[PDB]
Amino acid sequence: VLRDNIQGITKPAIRRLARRGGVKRISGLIYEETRGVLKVFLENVIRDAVTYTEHAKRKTVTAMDVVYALKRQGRTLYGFGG
Amino acid sequence: KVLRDNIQGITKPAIRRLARRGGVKRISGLIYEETRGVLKVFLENVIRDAVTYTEHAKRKTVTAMDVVYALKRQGRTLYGFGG
Amino acid sequence: GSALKRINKELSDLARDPPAQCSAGPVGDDMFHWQATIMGPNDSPYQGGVFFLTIHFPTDYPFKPPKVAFTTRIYHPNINSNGSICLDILRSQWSPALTISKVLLSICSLLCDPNPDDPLVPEIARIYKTDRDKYNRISREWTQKYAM
Amino acid sequence: SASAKTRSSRAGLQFPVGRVHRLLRKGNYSERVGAGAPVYLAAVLEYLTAEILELAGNAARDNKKTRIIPRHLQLAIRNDEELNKLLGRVTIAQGGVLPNIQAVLLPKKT
Amino acid sequence: SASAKTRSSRAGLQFPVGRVHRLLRKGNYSERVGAGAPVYLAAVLEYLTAEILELAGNAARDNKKTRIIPRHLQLAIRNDEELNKLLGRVTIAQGGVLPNIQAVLLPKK
Amino acid sequence: RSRKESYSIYVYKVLKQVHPDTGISSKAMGIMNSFVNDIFERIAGEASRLAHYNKRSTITSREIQTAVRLLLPGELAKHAVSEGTKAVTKYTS
Amino acid sequence: RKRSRKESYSIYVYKVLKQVHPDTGISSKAMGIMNSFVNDIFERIAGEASRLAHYNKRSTITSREIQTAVRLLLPGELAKHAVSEGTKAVTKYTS
Amino acid sequence: AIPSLSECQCGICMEILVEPVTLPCNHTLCKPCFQSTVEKASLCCPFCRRRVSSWTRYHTRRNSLVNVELWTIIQKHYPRECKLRASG
Amino acid sequence: KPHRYRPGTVALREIRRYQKSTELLIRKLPFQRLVREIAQDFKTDLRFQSSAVMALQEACEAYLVGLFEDTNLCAIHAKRVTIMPKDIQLARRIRGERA
Amino acid sequence: KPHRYRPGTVALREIRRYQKSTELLIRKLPFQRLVREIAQDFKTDLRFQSSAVMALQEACEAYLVGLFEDTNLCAIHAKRVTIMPKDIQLARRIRGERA
DNA sequence: TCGGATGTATATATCTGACACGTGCCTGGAGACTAGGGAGTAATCCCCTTGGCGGTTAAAACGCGGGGGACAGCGCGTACGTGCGTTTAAGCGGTGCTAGAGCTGTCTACGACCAATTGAGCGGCCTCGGCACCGGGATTCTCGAT
DNA sequence: ATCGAGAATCCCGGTGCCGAGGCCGCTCAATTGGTCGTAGACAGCTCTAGCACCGCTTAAACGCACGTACGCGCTGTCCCCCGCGTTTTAACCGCCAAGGGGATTACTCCCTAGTCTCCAGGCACGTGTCAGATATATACATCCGAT
Ligand SMILES: [Zn+2]
Ligand SMILES: [Zn+2]
Prior knowledge:
The complex is a heterodecamer, with 2 copies of chain A, 1 copy of chain C, 2 copies of chain D, 2 copies of chain F, 1 copy of chain H and 2 copies of chain I. Chain F has a single domain, classed as Histone, subunit A (Orthogonal Bundle), CATH 1.10.20. Helices cover 74% and strands 4% of the residues of chain F. Chain F is built from 4 helices and 2 strands, in the order αβαβαα. Chain H is mainly alpha-helical. Chain H has 4 helices and 2 strands; from the N terminus they run ββαααα. In chain H, strands 1-2 form a two-stranded antiparallel ribbon. The longest helix of chain H has 10 residues. The radius of gyration of chain H is 13 Å and the shape is globular. Chain H starts with 20 loop residues before the first strand and ends with a helix. Chain I has a single domain, classed as Histone, subunit A (Orthogonal Bundle), CATH 1.10.20.10. In chain I, α3 packs across α4. Chain I starts with 8 loop residues before the first helix and ends with a helix. Chains C and H meet through α1 of C and α1 of H. One zinc ion binds next to loops of chain H. The structure holds a DNA duplex. Chains I, J: One of its GO terms (biological process) is nucleosome assembly. Chains I, J: Belongs to the histone H3 family.
């Protein structure tokens, strides 16, 4: 049972992804908020992928169902077949 | 038929009620000019799509159905005008 | 689960409250299959006619409505070949709080004033709509021949 | 359902499952259409319409009006926290906007 | 042109025509599909691909690399303003970001 | 002339079924008709895409269930699929 | 058994790239990027054409349907250039 | 004013109120009946036939479906029936 | 001694009165003329109908109200009440509607 | 004398280096652990592969890059150089997914 | 704290146009029969995905000194809200024209659809060179002292 | 303004590698050629409403006057992220194993498209009846200057 490992997206990792965005200084408590928004987007896309998988009697989810999940979500992705 | 002077026809108090319905209470004077440009771009895009549909449809009378299609395609779908 | 308690309560209620001009109960040891004996209303083309009904209680009772079929063949616009009834509470408007008393009141009010709008046998409903009184004699004679 | 009557009545719904089936066939969505899909679709549409009408009727009763108007529908859609999500990007004609005021914009307490 | 060859050759194209024609046939778009529809659509994709590939190749040559990488594609998409509008929603695999810092972001002496 | 197709009577019928007293207006009826059409188009297009995904060619009830699971939010989709299951069960029996 | 045959636009986009750049290589990642891009654009244009045809109760997606679709989905410069290219292609095919 | 067991029986399965739910029409029904009703019935009130689905979806997230106050009251005053009905 | 209202109170009354109502705000004839201007710019000798321009004006109303609400938020973010142009361009940039 | 760089300059160096590169910025194993966590919360005993995990990871990075662009724009509009949470939820609200 | 002035809400006629209801009908929906081909199901096999160590190790985590900066506060001139007299045209009704949307009989050529087949297109193999990795050298800011 | 030591960064030479591209064999999808039901252009007729005017009334916009709330420029503060050094830890590559369900193929069966015939449900149309906008006439919460 895996629980409460959201710290995998950690302080330096989120800092670096922010620095990619052009920020210099970031307040020390935005980390929880960005982890929360990352979460909610993640279970949204995972809902879409897993139900796409459910439709096919498939025990595994592949990149194909999730790329169509992104397709419907309005975040069309390239580089994994379509 | 010659006709001109479009955008300044809209009245500053019209933008005033639009902002009021938006809910903002204190309005700068510079807002009114750029709101006109915003209407410029929005209207030109929407009716460009509408006239494209009409000219495709062998018809030169732009109906409400076509503009509803244009808004739906742009993702700003409007209701109460069929479809 | 609670279906056994519901059936016990229903049989107790019918013991305390026998329906007017009708009756019902278990056909035997089984609780899902029950028998009902009703008498045709006086204000109907079936004055004094006696009819039998077999009722199957489903697993999800009372939430799923039980299925009822008239044992005796009845020639009625709301009665089909196998004796089923085209009544709203039977399949669509079924309410668990409704007991056998209220549904029996509904069926007696339906039989007393037949409705050909939503029938099961088309020809008899159509002849009832065209002339209710020849239908009255024929239904009276039929409920005389098999209910006596 | 052994009743060989109208399919909408056979399914016990109000929306025309026959018309829905026809629209599925002539919509050019797929070569074949299952017989159970129109019933499911009509049920979903009827549920959505019924709940919209219920909430709009509640709004009208709040407004003490016995006739549903687009303002009632706008209030019903925006008041609900997930019908908004379903139709937030959408616009309702002649419906206006939900009555809201920013806290800071309120006058100074004097 | 009247000819008995592949449709792409007779039309002077590179993208397949019969394949696009079949995709229109079995893609659930219309009961009946016109003959000029596949060649027209193939030409449209032909122009799009030609332009994107030539811009990506120019960008790669600027980066002294003669083999195209997805970063070059992302730069090709975003450096142009019109095509960026055309492909605003899409995300490029291994694309990175356009190098840009806002003017006020830069520090002052 | 021509015979126009609309859902006016059905919306009025379900309204009277759910509200026996409150009336309707022409503009509200138009809004309801177009909203039903829009939801129909969304669900049916999603189902068509799902059928195309599995190389299938038939739109059955399961594809509609999947499409309504994708489109509507959580418990709205739950209620919709429950209603669809009840409707298809009543249709079968 | 035999592996099911798959489809890609690899060879054709390679031909186009060589025609426009006779000394430029392409990696597999960007190659799949181009395959996905062409599939997405094809789906967009075909869907718009089908939607327009249904919106005009027309049973045939003729060349004019895709003409309108590309005129719409493409901004000005690309729209006119693609229209010109497509008209050239169709007139060459019919001539 | 504590009602007796008969007033504390639900209106469907004749059993006690467990995790009672209060409807806007002030109608109360024991929780399993409500579960097997709202998803497996006509979505209407089992007493006045009113469509209470909107209330259900409104209150599902905040867990305000169950009436906490009367549940606490009956647990304080009639705990043994609740323990007996815990296993159905 | 005229009853000169303080700046803002009648503004809020006016907010409420146009916010509880749904009547159209942009004047009919000038908007119709402007729409015809841009249409005949795009295509000469083009004819409209009333319902089409009605829908156009409703869409314009909705767009303007949404944009002005977003302007409200982004302006009140800066601890200001006076909406500047910078609010308008920032709001249009976050939505990404100007490409 | 020990040498310490002025804060902000190395910030710009990091920004330029990362805007120049394209490698993954989130560790794949923690990300797939989170993905499997939501998966098991959604359906027990579900299976993935490396390609799908990469797809979700890159979609996450693209979405967060866009969100951080928007929040940097909001913060700089707010006469600040530090992004605050209020910027984060405001940028989310303007984008049109939470409201 | 405070009493008029203001707008807002409430009570009642009335008259109005919109909504609900009855009718004709007629075309779309419904029931029956058929065929077949698409979908469900059994069998298999093998690709890869989970799982597991195990060594290495770049990177996460923590402490800490500190300096840039968000935040608190003051004033001040300014553009903006508010009110009024004025002007302007927006809206309402009423007329007239006709140009174009829309419906109708129809002929025809664009294309649905099937047998033959073959070569373009794809799966697998093989080869070398564009580029990754590394070490070293020269070039570009940078920050403390003026 | 300046220069100098110090890191930080682009560049050159070298070496290796694995995957990008070319070549070969083979299967099946595109091409040819023919037939035939049919969407659709198409000329023609009907009739609806959109344009344009025209007069008029009156509500809304304009320009101005005026008092001022605050946007903002500036100042002062302490506080909270940053850089860097030091320590630990799980990431990361490499390897091997089992099996499991993804994928593929062969067999069968029954659901549904297609046609045909039949019928009533819903829409166009007309018309009765009332919900509420409008208009007038009352009473009260509230604003702000005054206390
Ligand atoms: Zn109970
Ligand atoms: Zn009730």
